[PDB]
């Protein structure tokens, strides 16, 4: 008797996928939803970026020698590398990580001179073999190491005031020097009890030099720690000090917004990406990703899974 029969296609070996009710369902086809592959490069096409190489973001503001080409500029993407240098003279910044993040959320840095001057009783031009430029001794480009001009004398009580006449807030930084011995402290500031006060309309604080023997770092047992604050438009900030201040010769203004990336991957200007990680860039259209929980940009969501395949065909029912 004559016949017409209905049916569907099948393939030789299907692809296994998961369902609600079955861990081992066979279908005629499937495609991956978890991205396991990365490009081992920072994809910078379409971006105004600054590769800081050797310079740590904080060194941009205080003017460490490794940061000379990064003292000002604009960018929509800022790239920090491992082991970068902030401090040539050994020290540390209070609230360091908050400061680094702030620099790395920014789109640029301007510099504005403080205008500070000093009597011929103060000497402001001192340098150190720990901070070197042009084969010679130097110092943080944006600050100055004030000491007494005639050794051993009590450093004069001094007032220096910076005035934000702009319409945006400025970030001001200063250092406090912590000598490694009593004689050292006396040689460069005198025998008097030292004090450094710092006041604006929205901030004040005092600082006294810790003196004591400690290990040499980059040849120095002394230390200079950094401090910072934001000075609002129309506000002034005054420094009263009689020894131990490392005074700013310039202040900074962070401009706009940018994306901060920490990675040692090399720059490629001929690919684009919106998602970066320590190892490179992630350019996938896929919704998920198992490369790293630490990503930046606009990124597929991190998942704990090697693979999750989505069926693109019917049940496979082979002959």
């Amino acid at each position: 008797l004559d016949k017409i029969c209905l049916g569907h296609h099948a393939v030789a070996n299907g692809t296994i996928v998961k369902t609600l009710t079955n861990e081992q369902e066979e279908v005629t086809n499937a495609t991956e939803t978890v991205e396991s592959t990365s490009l081992d490069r920072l994809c910078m096409k379409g971006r105004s970026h600054k590769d800081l190489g050797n310079c740590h973001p904080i060194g941009m503001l205080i003017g460490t020698p490794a940061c000379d080409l990064h003292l000002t500029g604009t960018w929509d993407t800022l790239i920090e590398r491992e082991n970068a240098i902030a401090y040539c003279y050994p020290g540390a910044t209070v609230n360091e990580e908050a400061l680094r993040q702030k620099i790395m959320e920014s789109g640029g840095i301007s510099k504005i001179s403080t205008g500070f001057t000093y009597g011929s009783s103060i000497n402001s031009a001192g340098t150190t073999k720990a901070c070197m430029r042009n084969g010679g001794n130097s110092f943080y480009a944006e600050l100055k190491w004030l000491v007494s001009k005639s050794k051993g004398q009590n450093f004069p009580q001094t007032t220096n005031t910076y005035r934000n006449t702009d319409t945006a807030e400025h970030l001001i930084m200063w250092g406090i020097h912590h000598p490694s011995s009593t004689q050292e402290k006396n040689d460069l500031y005198g025998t008097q009890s030292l004090s450094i006060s710092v006041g604006s309309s929205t901030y004040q604080s005092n600082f006294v030099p810790v003196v004591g023997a400690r290990p040499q770092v980059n040849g120095q047992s002394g230390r200079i720690d950094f401090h910072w604050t934001l000075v609002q438009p129309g506000d002034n900030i005054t420094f009263s000090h009689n020894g131990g201040l490392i005074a700013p010769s310039r202040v900074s203004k962070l401009i706009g917004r940018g994306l901060g990336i920490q990675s040692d991957a090399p720059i490629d200007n001929n690919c684009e990406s919106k998602c970066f990680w320590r190892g490179g860039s992630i350019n996938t259209r896929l919704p998920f990703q198992n490369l790293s929980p630490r990503t930046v940009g606009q990124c597929p969501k991190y998942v704990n899974k090697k693979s999750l395949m989505l069926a693109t065909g019917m049940r496979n029912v082979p002959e």
Partner: protein
């Protein structure tokens, strides 16, 4: 499965049908033929494409780093961040699995439903000129040449044109 057709009363698929997802096999006096149905095939593919289109679509949210790669985070804030990131990861991992399992099921059932819809469509065209063998075919009680076969696939088979005879053949 749900619609009882694929992996159902149709026992298996045809590996020799590379030009479509669903289709026909006939047997008449002039022999044997196979042919895909373009319409049913495209209804299943277009549903898949809609799924894929929906799956690649982007959340535009821009995230910054809250963890340094090259320096150590204060211990307490570090633990809050780790706790939070791991919780967020458990949520997305669960969603991803659930999404893909759920869609896989629906893809399957939808493919099944298109097979059933094609079959039902044929059943009604033929009307009283054929009967169901249970395995997915219609035993036809009248001479249907390749051109008549092509009408059924063409969806222009007019059961009136063959009825009086087919009733004779069925009740005989």
């Amino acid at each position: 499965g749900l619609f009882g057709a694929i992996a159902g009363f149709i026992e298996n698929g045809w590996e020799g049908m590379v030009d479509g997802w669903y289709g026909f096999r006939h047997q008449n006096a002039q022999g044997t033929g196979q042919a895909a149905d373009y319409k049913s095939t495209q209804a299943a593919i277009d549903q898949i494409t809609g799924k894929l289109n929906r799956l690649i679509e982007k959340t535009n949210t821009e995230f910054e780093s809250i963890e340094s790669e090259f320096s150590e985070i204060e211990h307490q804030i570090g633990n809050v961040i780790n706790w939070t990131k791991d919780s967020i990861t458990d949520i997305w991992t669960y969603q991803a699995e659930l999404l893909v399992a759920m869609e896989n099921q629906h893809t399957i059932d939808m493919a099944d439903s298109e097979m059933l819809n094609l079959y039902e469509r044929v059943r009604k065209q033929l009307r009283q000129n054929a009967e169901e063998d249970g395995k997915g075919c219609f035993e036809i009680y009248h001479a249907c040449d390749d051109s008549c076969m092509e009408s059924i696939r063409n969806n222009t088979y007019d059961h009136s044109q063959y009825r009086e005879e087919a009733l004779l053949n069925r009740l005989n």
